Amino acid sequence: MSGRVGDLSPRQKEALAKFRENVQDVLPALPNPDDYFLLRWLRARSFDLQKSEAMLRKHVEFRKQKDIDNIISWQPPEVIQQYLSGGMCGYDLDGCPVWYDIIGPLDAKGLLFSASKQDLLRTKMRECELLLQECAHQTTKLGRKVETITIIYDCEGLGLKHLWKPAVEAYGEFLCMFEENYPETLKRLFVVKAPKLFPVAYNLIKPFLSEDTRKKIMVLGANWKEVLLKHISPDQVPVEYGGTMTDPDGNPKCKSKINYGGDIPRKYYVRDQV
Template identity: 65%
Template sequence: MSGRIGDLSPKQAEILAEFRERIQDILPSLPAQHDHYLLRWLRARSFNVHKAESMIRKHVVFREQMKVDTILSDWKPPEVIEKYVSGGMCGYDREGSPVWYDVIGPLDPKGLLMSATKQDFLKTKIQNTEMLRQECQKQSEKLGKYIESITLIYDCEGLGLKHIWKPAIETYGEILTMFEDNYPEGLKRVFLIKAPKMFPVAYNLIKHFLCEETRRKIIVLGSNWQEVLREHIDPDQLPVVYGGTLTDPDGDPHCRTMINFGGTVPKSYYVQDSVKVQYNKSVTISRGSVIQLEYDVPAASSLLRWQFASDGADIGFGVYKRTKEGSQQKIAEMQQVLPSERYNAHLVPEDSCLTCPEPGVYVLCFDNSYSILQSKKVRYKVEVIPPADVLMQYPRSSGDGRLQ
């Protein structure tokens, strides 16, 4: 049995009912509550109800932390991402699913990662994925059948050494992990076209980020790739450059109004060249170690701002709040305020802030526990800005996020 509506075994139907009952408390926080949606999480965990419950509960936390419910309306990617990250949605396959194109060759990974933070790229991909999720909903209503996944066309022409630069692979890996953990069963199939000889090298670097089910959906096409695409996508839904008849209104065969083809990022976008911060402190975090920096926030609605840059490699960073006074407290025992993530602060200095909802001792944690060989030097500056001064210093800041 496929584990889909209309094709459930009695045991699978029983597990679905149990799953729904176990997550009653978080159902209102999910983007959908119908059985089609819940079954995606169960299929992703082979109908192990405990694993599926753990996965979907983590997703609810993810949606809250990343402000996913409002990311389409409230977040705008940096200009460099909008201009130079290639790809886009264009048309629908024969079953009505949206088709997304990732165009690898024109991508300038180093230029992009020197010009925007890794977190900016993650948010952009979340925004894209939420747009596609909503597009699937619209198609479901339009066609009168459930559309839950997309067709992805991966144009590998021009794939080269610049695309397997280590920071780029690490960032792409985090994006893939985010997608696998939070949008299960979102891919119907992946068509890889125009793959060069070095494709196996690149694929081996990222395949461990993909679950086995996703790997099975990847189809590497040969010289007849246009013919195969037309078998799955009507010609009037397929751009001319990919073997169809679809063009932009001005006749552009690449459909550039829908698919961005990127390009080399001008160095004028590079943040390292434009940001000059006077860091007043520095610290070296030994390999496998964590450093905690404590800051007393005397009043609610104060702004906690941090700026930091690392030398030579990325660094983990998160913000926590102590829940006990006086005695020492482990990070695991503290209240998480900002989840720990790895920042490419050696490429793009970090400059962010948050509004402290209540007074107390806030702990900034620089995490190098994942590095078994390399210590990291971090230069940083931290400010606690009283509520009365926030509006004067940052009149256009929401007090939560990256400062421009």
């Protein structure tokens, strides 16, 4: 069985009960430690109690060290706010928030020359917290638990410039952070408009991904818009990605929700090498 609330085996139920007993000392430090929450850690370690507990306790320390309880009120530095692409836009057919990643126009080198790695990673943590907050809001709105996210991963324009080694290493640090602190949060990731370079790029970051994450990555072909609309209502998808959603001013890219990156002006640079 699936290891989710309502659908646990006897062994899974027993493990959940022991797990809650075993980690009860840190539950007051945690956001809404309901069965759904605990089961994400258990599923991520195949209900191994020792490993699940180690994973959760490491997360507790992460939350303290990164001040996660207050990260939503932290606005990133100007260069990040203005040029770090992507954004939350719409909900899928099951009510899960959708996040757009826009790789092509991302100036990875400009970002690392203009911001600390710590602030870039902190910005990604904040995005994850914003997505989980949206899931909690959807849960209330829909009257059923929403705790996963759909990602549209736009690889149009993916190029050798993105595989600059310090960029790959920084991105791997984000991916490790994601896997260790947001287990069982990804529902599906649709790669769209991937060029021929994609398999090499994918191989560079595969070591940072869990098996669970890898199974949720779907690389789409020429009919990607049609596939997206099998999963998300058109009114929830930007015109740019095959739907009917626009900004209030009519812009088909929904730039009020999604950042489209761009090359970073030199006035933002803070260092000469990385």
